[PDB]
Every structure is written in C-alpha cells, then in structure tokens.
Amino acid sequence: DLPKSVDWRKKGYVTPVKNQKQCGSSWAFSATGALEGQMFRKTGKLVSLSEQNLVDCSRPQGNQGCNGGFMARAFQYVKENGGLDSEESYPYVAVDEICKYRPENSVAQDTGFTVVAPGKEKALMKAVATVGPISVAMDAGHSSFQFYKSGIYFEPDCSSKNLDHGVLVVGYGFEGANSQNSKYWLVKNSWGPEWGSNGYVKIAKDKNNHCGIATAASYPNV
Amino acid sequence: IILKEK
C-alpha cells in the first residue's frame, strides 16, 4: 500500500531552494524541480537545471516568460527541443532575454509528460509516492501565504480552480502518531529559503483539494 | 493553460 509519509529531500532528489525574484516564472522553477528529481532517479546525479533556458526559449509552446506559463508547456518544450541546459551553463537573471539554448550544455531530456487525474488528491499521493517530486499549480494569491511561516497552511479564501503559482510537491505527511490526521503536502516554493519554512510550506492535505494542489499536477517522462 | 503570474 502507499507509505504514510514521503520526503524526497531526504533521498537526494531535490536541489536547494531557489528564488524567482521579480519575474513571474514559478512555472519554470516547478518544471525544473520535477525534472531535477527525474534525472536524479535515472542517473544518480543531482544537477541544478536552467529556469532561464525555459523563460527565454519556450514561447512557441505557449509560455510567456516572466509574465507566466505552465509546467506541462515547459516539459513539451523540453521534449520538442531535445534537451535543457544546466543552471551553471545558463544562469538565472530574472528577466526575459534572448534564447541561448546550447545543446552541448544539455543535462536533461524528457519524452513528454504524465498528468495526474484532475482534483484527485489520492492520485497525487500515489504519484508522489511512486515517481518522485510532482509539479503542481495552486492558488497562492493571499497575504496569508505571502506571510506564511510555520505549521499547516489552510486558507479559507483559497480556490481550487483559479490558480496562479507553480510549486513542487516533494512529499507528504501528517502531524502526530495517527497517519490519517492533520495531513499535509510538503511543497517547495521558489521565493528563496527566507520565505516560509526554509523555502517550504505544508499545505493542508485531504481537505477537498485545498488551494487546487491536485487540479493540475504533472511530471516529466525521462 | 497558463498561470498568469504578472
């Protein structure tokens, strides 16, 4: 059956917390996070990937650089493009720039991606437990989220359908000794390690898809 | 589908 708790950071699949700064590129950090976990599973090497490569080059797939985008479009770009560069070879500058993708600097590839059935938290749990970190969209436009600090995040104003931020679910768990109470999703954000809990947030889990965590989740196929 | 971030 599925584990009671999962935390892929303890297994080497997750890079340190990054910062998107003033660019609306959360979608790009969510996509690189999921790709960093799948590459690690395939090769045993953790290599930080280029969000800038995605910001500058994926407009043909429908992304809008610093104005917005979507993780599934980023994985499509990776598929159609044949690769994705490392962060060290294509650094992040938080502004839309000229596409400078270099195939010789590619350290990741995908063949498309798999989507988790919309709105199904149990299906999201199955994906997290069997695959690795999963890219998800959520409604993050709340001052309570901006000022989040500890504990399980639960916000009555959250929507499960109007989403505006891409994040990465790296695990799940519960508080206490009963595995079925006070559950939460372990989510990595892209607002720097100074935001939230060392850059992470526990979002209420199994509470009717809180903030839309399971509404649009997906992962790359490597 | 796109997340309007800015």
Author numbering:
A (entry chain AA): 1 to 222
B (entry chain PA): 444 to 449
Q: Can you provide the manuscript's text about this entry?
A:
The pattern III group (binding shifted to the primed side) consisted of structures of eight non-protected peptides that all bound uncleaved into the primed sites. Electron density maps in the region from P1′–P3′ and partly P4′ of molecule A enabled an unambiguous interpretation. On the non-primed side, the MPD molecule occupied the S2 site, and the CL- anion occupied the same position as the carbonyl oxygens of P1 residues in pattern groups I and II. Its negative charge appeared to mimic the absent negatively charged SG atom of the reactive site cysteine. Three sequences TRESEDLE, EVCKKKK, and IILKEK were among examples of cathepsin V single protein cleavages, but they were cleaved two or three times in the peptidyl form. Peptides from patterns I and IV bound to cathepsin V consistent with the observed protein cleavage sites, whereas the peptides from patterns II and III did not bind according to their cleavage site found in proteins. Their binding appeared to be biased by the absence of the negative charge of the reactive site Cys, which caused a shift in binding.
Addressing the elusive specificity of cysteine cathepsins, which in contrast to caspases and trypsin-like proteases lack strict specificity determining P1 pocket, calls for innovative approaches. Hence, we set out to determine the crystal structures of cathepsin complexes with representative peptides of cleaved substrates. As a working model, cathepsin V was chosen because of the resolution of diffracting crystals (up to 1.3 Å) and crystal packing with accessible active site cleft. Reactive site mutants C25A and C25S of cathepsin V were used in structural studies.
